[PDB]
Each structure stands twice: as structure tokens, then as C-alpha cells.
Design a protein around this motif. Structure first.
Motif, PDB file in Angstrom:
ATOM      1  N   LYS A  53       0.824  -1.205   0.000  1.00 32.66           N
ATOM      2  CA  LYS A  53       0.000   0.000   0.000  1.00 32.66           C
ATOM      3  C   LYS A  53       0.858   1.253   0.000  1.00 32.66           C
ATOM      4  CE  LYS A  53      -3.845   0.267   2.165  1.00 32.66           C
ATOM      5  NZ  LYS A  53      -5.032   0.115   3.050  1.00 32.66           N
ATOM      6  N   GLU A  54       1.836   1.299   0.893  1.00 27.88           N
ATOM      7  CA  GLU A  54       2.684   2.472   0.984  1.00 27.88           C
ATOM      8  C   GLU A  54       3.474   2.668  -0.304  1.00 27.88           C
ATOM      9  OE1 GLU A  54       5.568   2.500   4.010  1.00 27.88           O
ATOM     10  OE2 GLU A  54       5.528   4.641   4.240  1.00 27.88           O
ATOM     11  N   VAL A  55       4.146   1.612  -0.758  1.00 31.65           N
ATOM     12  CA  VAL A  55       4.940   1.702  -1.983  1.00 31.65           C
ATOM     13  C   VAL A  55       4.064   2.179  -3.136  1.00 31.65           C
ATOM     14  CG1 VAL A  55       6.142   0.347  -3.737  1.00 31.65           C
ATOM     15  CG2 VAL A  55       6.677   0.017  -1.313  1.00 31.65           C
ATOM     16  N   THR A  56       2.869   1.615  -3.235  1.00 33.31           N
ATOM     17  CA  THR A  56       1.943   2.002  -4.288  1.00 33.31           C
ATOM     18  C   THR A  56       1.486   3.445  -4.088  1.00 33.31           C
ATOM     19  OG1 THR A  56       0.198   0.995  -2.969  1.00 33.31           O
ATOM     20  CG2 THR A  56       1.144  -0.331  -4.749  1.00 33.31           C
ATOM     21  N   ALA A  87      15.134  -7.516  -4.479  1.00 26.41           N
ATOM     22  CA  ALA A  87      15.335  -7.037  -5.840  1.00 26.41           C
ATOM     23  C   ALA A  87      14.170  -7.467  -6.729  1.00 26.41           C
ATOM     24  CB  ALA A  87      16.648  -7.597  -6.401  1.00 26.41           C
ATOM     25  N   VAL A  88      13.794  -8.738  -6.624  1.00 32.71           N
ATOM     26  CA  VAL A  88      12.688  -9.265  -7.416  1.00 32.71           C
ATOM     27  C   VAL A  88      11.365  -8.644  -6.977  1.00 32.71           C
ATOM     28  CG1 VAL A  88      11.344 -11.323  -7.951  1.00 32.71           C
ATOM     29  CG2 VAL A  88      13.850 -11.415  -7.949  1.00 32.71           C
ATOM     30  N   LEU A  89      11.258  -8.312  -5.696  1.00 30.21           N
ATOM     31  CA  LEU A  89      10.037  -7.715  -5.184  1.00 30.21           C
ATOM     32  C   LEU A  89       9.835  -6.352  -5.837  1.00 30.21           C
ATOM     33  CD1 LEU A  89       7.622  -7.574  -3.382  1.00 30.21           C
ATOM     34  CD2 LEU A  89       9.083  -6.665  -1.559  1.00 30.21           C
ATOM     35  N   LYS A  90      10.939  -5.627  -6.009  1.00 29.84           N
ATOM     36  CA  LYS A  90      10.893  -4.310  -6.630  1.00 29.84           C
ATOM     37  C   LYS A  90      10.458  -4.418  -8.088  1.00 29.84           C
ATOM     38  CE  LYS A  90      14.149  -1.893  -3.700  1.00 29.84           C
ATOM     39  NZ  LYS A  90      15.519  -1.311  -3.620  1.00 29.84           N
ATOM     40  N   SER A  91      11.123  -5.293  -8.834  1.00 31.37           N
ATOM     41  CA  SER A  91      10.791  -5.475 -10.241  1.00 31.37           C
ATOM     42  C   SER A  91       9.377  -6.016 -10.383  1.00 31.37           C
ATOM     43  CB  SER A  91      11.782  -6.438 -10.897  1.00 31.37           C
ATOM     44  OG  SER A  91      11.712  -7.699 -10.245  1.00 31.37           O
ATOM     45  N   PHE A  92       8.980  -6.884  -9.456  1.00 35.53           N
ATOM     46  CA  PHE A  92       7.639  -7.448  -9.499  1.00 35.53           C
ATOM     47  C   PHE A  92       6.614  -6.320  -9.419  1.00 35.53           C
ATOM     48  CE2 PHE A  92       4.206  -7.605  -6.506  1.00 35.53           C
ATOM     49  CZ  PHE A  92       3.291  -8.433  -7.155  1.00 35.53           C
ATOM     50  N   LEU A  93       6.727  -5.485  -8.392  1.00 37.23           N
ATOM     51  CA  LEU A  93       5.794  -4.377  -8.239  1.00 37.23           C
ATOM     52  C   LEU A  93       5.912  -3.423  -9.411  1.00 37.23           C
ATOM     53  CD1 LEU A  93       5.618  -3.426  -4.494  1.00 37.23           C
ATOM     54  CD2 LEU A  93       3.710  -3.827  -6.090  1.00 37.23           C
ATOM     55  N   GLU A  94       7.140  -3.034  -9.718  1.00 39.81           N
ATOM     56  CA  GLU A  94       7.393  -2.091 -10.802  1.00 39.81           C
ATOM     57  C   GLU A  94       6.600  -2.465 -12.048  1.00 39.81           C
ATOM     58  OE1 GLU A  94      11.373  -1.812 -12.060  1.00 39.81           O
ATOM     59  OE2 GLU A  94      11.130   0.177 -12.852  1.00 39.81           O
ATOM     60  N   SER A  95       6.718  -3.716 -12.466  1.00 44.91           N
ATOM     61  CA  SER A  95       5.997  -4.182 -13.641  1.00 44.91           C
ATOM     62  C   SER A  95       4.492  -4.211 -13.381  1.00 44.91           C
ATOM     63  CB  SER A  95       6.474  -5.584 -14.022  1.00 44.91           C
ATOM     64  OG  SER A  95       5.761  -6.029 -15.168  1.00 44.91           O
ATOM     65  N   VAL A  96       4.115  -4.685 -12.197  1.00 50.90           N
ATOM     66  CA  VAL A  96       2.705  -4.796 -11.841  1.00 50.90           C
ATOM     67  C   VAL A  96       2.040  -3.430 -11.694  1.00 50.90           C
ATOM     68  CG1 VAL A  96       1.083  -5.693 -10.159  1.00 50.90           C
ATOM     69  CG2 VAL A  96       3.194  -6.969 -10.651  1.00 50.90           C
ATOM     70  N   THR A 154      10.700   0.505  -7.709  1.00 48.65           N
ATOM     71  CA  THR A 154      12.102   0.345  -7.332  1.00 48.65           C
ATOM     72  C   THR A 154      12.449   1.376  -6.266  1.00 48.65           C
ATOM     73  OG1 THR A 154      12.366   1.351  -9.512  1.00 48.65           O
ATOM     74  CG2 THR A 154      13.297  -0.854  -9.210  1.00 48.65           C
ATOM     75  N   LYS A 155      11.544   2.330  -6.095  1.00 47.85           N
ATOM     76  CA  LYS A 155      11.700   3.379  -5.104  1.00 47.85           C
ATOM     77  C   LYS A 155      11.271   2.861  -3.732  1.00 47.85           C
ATOM     78  CE  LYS A 155      13.241   7.397  -6.603  1.00 47.85           C
ATOM     79  NZ  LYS A 155      13.996   8.411  -5.814  1.00 47.85           N
ATOM     80  N   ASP A 156      11.066   1.548  -3.639  1.00 45.66           N
ATOM     81  CA  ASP A 156      10.648   0.933  -2.385  1.00 45.66           C
ATOM     82  C   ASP A 156      11.800   0.922  -1.384  1.00 45.66           C
ATOM     83  OD1 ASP A 156       9.727  -0.459  -0.323  1.00 45.66           O
ATOM     84  OD2 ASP A 156       9.120  -2.218  -1.409  1.00 45.66           O
ATOM     85  N   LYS A 157      11.994   2.045  -0.689  1.00 42.54           N
ATOM     86  CA  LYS A 157      13.074   2.155   0.289  1.00 42.54           C
ATOM     87  C   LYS A 157      12.637   2.960   1.514  1.00 42.54           C
ATOM     88  CE  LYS A 157      15.628   4.357  -2.584  1.00 42.54           C
ATOM     89  NZ  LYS A 157      16.633   4.808  -3.589  1.00 42.54           N
ATOM     90  N   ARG A 158      11.378   3.392   1.538  1.00 45.40           N
ATOM     91  CA  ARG A 158      10.884   4.184   2.663  1.00 45.40           C
ATOM     92  C   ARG A 158      10.847   3.362   3.950  1.00 45.40           C
ATOM     93  NH1 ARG A 158       9.139   9.038   1.482  1.00 45.40           N
ATOM     94  NH2 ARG A 158       8.696   9.589  -0.665  1.00 45.40           N
ATOM     95  N   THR A 159      10.059   2.286   3.955  1.00 43.93           N
ATOM     96  CA  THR A 159       9.939   1.436   5.140  1.00 43.93           C
ATOM     97  C   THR A 159       9.959  -0.037   4.751  1.00 43.93           C
ATOM     98  OG1 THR A 159       7.533   1.352   5.065  1.00 43.93           O
ATOM     99  CG2 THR A 159       8.547   3.255   6.141  1.00 43.93           C
ATOM    100  N   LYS A 160      10.903  -0.406   3.892  1.00 36.14           N
ATOM    101  CA  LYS A 160      11.018  -1.792   3.450  1.00 36.14           C
ATOM    102  C   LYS A 160      11.752  -2.628   4.496  1.00 36.14           C
ATOM    103  CE  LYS A 160      11.627  -4.376  -0.777  1.00 36.14           C
ATOM    104  NZ  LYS A 160      12.325  -4.421  -2.091  1.00 36.14           N
TER     105      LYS A 160
END
Length: 225
Positions: free
Chosen positions: A12-15, A179-188, A138-144
Motif C-alpha cells: 500500500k505504501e509503496v503504491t 530485488a525481485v520484489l521491486k521489479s515485481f511491483l514495478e511491472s505490476v 524500485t523506489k521501495d526504500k521508505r519502510t522496506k
């Protein structure tokens, strides 16, 4: 606000880091299931190698067995480069695995909040600019950091176990996993805003997680049949 839940925050946050319009949008648990989709596959893979033995390994002299097995897998910290497309398949099978369960939940009945998910007649947002943010997850770095916090402690994974003295044993695999989590979301997500929008909807359509993962695996299979 209603209840604490680091997991949901991850997705939710990343999105929400994207278009400000989603500064306070609580889509259905569908997006949350998507999070578990990435975790579900990794959980099986991690569990497949770690095994309950890795958890209680210290207690069990087996600290040198199924452990070294987990070391022989993903033990190498290499980035995609077409080193072995034939193998990238197996990895894709794991991604598709989560795509299958999502196919089943693709019929989730909004049991919680209600936004323009499939009905397209509800909107729980403040308001902003209508555009394809695609700020790249890929900007998922706030509270990961919460992901690793609960991801490991949940499995109590010891990993290679017999560190031998490396110590840096941990942090390598978990790093690539993220890393895969980032690309997964990024694409999704990128596809979510793109397809969800074309669906006169500005939320999270299960179609994105399913359709997005579908095209990803298709390109990886190196085929278009």
C-alpha cells in the motif's frame, strides 16, 4: 489508522508513493494478496531449501546438510544477464506460481473498504493530477526494512548454517529477494495504473496482477505462442 499491518504498508505504501491522489486510498485486500503472492512463492522456495531443519539446525547437528544445499542455491549473487535463459525458467515458474493463486483470488468479494476496483462506481481518494505516475516501485526504500524484519524472524532461516566464518552469509539472499520484489511491483503497478486506468478505474484491478505477470512470464519464456 484502523489497525497496524507492516505487510499491507509494504504494498500500500509503496503504491501510494506514486500519484499523490493515492495519499489515502485503502483498496481491497486484493492488492494485499498481491504482496503475499511475492512472499508465497519465496516462502515455498525459502522453505524448500531452509527446511524446518535450518530453523532448529543449531539444536540439530544437521547444521551441516540441507544447509549446504541452501548454500548451493542462489548462493551466487549475480544479476540477470542471460547467463542461462534455460534456467531463468524455473525462477519464472515460481513467479507464475504466485500468479496462479492470484488467479483464484481474482474473484475476491470486496469484504473490506470499497473503491473503484471492479465496479468503477466508488472512489476513496483526496484528489490530485490525473497522469501515469509510474514512479517505479524500485523506489521501495521508505519502510522496506519491515519486510526483512518479519520475513526472516518468521522463517527463522539460518541459511547456509555452517557459516564457516563468513558471517556475511545473511544479507546476500535477502537482498536479491527484495530485488525481485521491486521489479515485481514495478511491472505490476506500472501496468496497474496503465490497465486499471484504461478500465475507467484508478485503483488496483486483480487483472493487473494477473495480466502483468502473464506478459512477464511470456517474454521470459522467449516465446509468444
Amino acid at each position: 489508522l484502523i489497525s497496524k499491518i507492516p505487510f499491507a504498508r509494504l504494498v500500500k505504501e509503496v503504491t501510494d508513493e506514486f500519484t499523490t491522489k493515492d495519499q489515502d486510498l485503502r483498496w481491497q485486500s486484493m492488492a494485499i494478496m498481491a504482496l503475499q503472492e511475492a512472499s508465497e512463492a519465496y516462502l515455498v522456495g525459502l522453505l524448500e531449501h531452509t527446511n524446518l531443519l535450518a530453523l532448529h539446525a543449531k539444536r540439530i547437528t544437521i547444521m551441516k546438510k540441507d544447509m549446504q544445499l541452501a548454500r548451493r542455491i542462489r548462493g551466487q549473487f549475480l544479476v540477470p544477464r542471460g547467463s542461462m535463459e534455460r534456467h531463468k525458467l524455473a525462477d519464472e515458474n515460481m513467479r507464475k506460481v504466485w500468479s496462479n493463486i492470484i488467479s483464484k483470488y481474482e474473484s475476491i468479494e470486496e469484504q473490506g473498504d470499497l473503491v473503484d476496483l471492479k465496479t468503477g462506481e466508488i472512489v476513496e481518494d483526496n484528489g490530485h493530477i490525473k497522469t501515469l505516475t509510474a514512479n517505479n516501485s524500485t523506489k521501495d526504500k521508505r519502510t522496506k526494512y519491515t519486510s526483512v524484519l518479519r520475513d526472516i524472524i518468521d522463517i527463522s532461516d539460518e541459511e547456509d548454517g555452517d557459516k564457516g566464518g563468513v558471517k556475511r552469509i545473511s544479507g546476500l539472499i535477502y537482498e536479491e529477494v527484495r530485488a525481485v520484489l521491486k521489479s515485481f511491483l514495478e511491472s505490476v503497478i506500472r501496468d496497474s495504473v496503465t490497465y486499471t486506468e484504461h478500465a475507467k478505474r484508478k485503483t488496483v484491478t486483480s487483472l493487473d496482477v494477473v495480466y502483468a505477470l502473464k506478459r512477464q512470464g511470456r517474454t521470459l519464456y522467449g516465446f509468444g505462442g
